[PDB]
């Protein structure tokens, strides 16, 4: 029983609420696989691939940051597992830090291991 233009105004706010809520749901579904809280075999594979390519290319595993190392620790300790709190407060990691919770030996073993495979193949030519 609202007036002439009340419903359009309400729908505008509802549409923005749904877009914000819908986006956070989309982010949670992808980030839950990084957390290991959802089935992530495809994501495990491509991460193993993606990070190995960086090792042999020489680039840092997570990239380069304009933030001081101390401030990288602050960013890491703020957004770490933060998507589990998305029903109350949103947060996103936009920093390039080296605190991802994972022992990074696995990325170097593969890189070394398939650097020799390309070495033997190069020789046998």
């Amino acid at each position: 029983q609202v007036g002439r233009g009340g419903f359009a105004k309400a729908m505008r706010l509802a549409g923005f609420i749904g877009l914000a809520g819908g986006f956070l749901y989309f982010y949670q579904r992808s980030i839950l696989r990084f957390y290991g809280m959802s089935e992530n075999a495809r994501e495990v594979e491509m991460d193993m691939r993606e990070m190995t390519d960086r090792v042999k290319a020489g680039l840092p595993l997570y990239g380069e940051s304009r933030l001081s190392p101390a401030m990288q620790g602050v960013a890491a300790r703020q957004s770490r597992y933060s998507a589990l709190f998305f029903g109350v407060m949103p947060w996103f990691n936009f920093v390039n830090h080296n605190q991802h919770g994972v022992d990074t030996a696995k990325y170097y073993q593969q890189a070394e291991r398939e650097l020799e495979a390309e070495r033997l193949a190069r020789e046998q030519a």
Partner: protein
């Protein structure tokens, strides 16, 4: 006699806005270490308090519009019965 509520609003909005400015003064003397990351939180803090000021402005708790010839009757001639 009754007193004017605008006096309470002026003091209320002053105090609440006085607190928020106070909370930004540490940032202005710490901008170098805060850099980009501290600036984000300051901008988040400013954005939140700006919305409450929009509420202040939109509802005009200071009575911005305190002080302020369409005719409802139109007549039609039809003639003799």
């Amino acid at each position: 006699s009754p007193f004017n509520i605008s006096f309470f609003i002026y003091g209320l909005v002053f105090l609440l806005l006085d607190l928020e400015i106070l909370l930004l003064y540490p940032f202005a003397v710490s901008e170098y270490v805060n850099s980009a990351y501290g600036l984000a939180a300051a901008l988040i803090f400013i954005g939140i308090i700006t919305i409450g000021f929009v509420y202040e402005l939109g509802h005009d708790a200071l009575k911005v519009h305190s002080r302020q010839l369409k005719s409802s009757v139109v007549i039609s001639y039809l003639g003799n019965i």
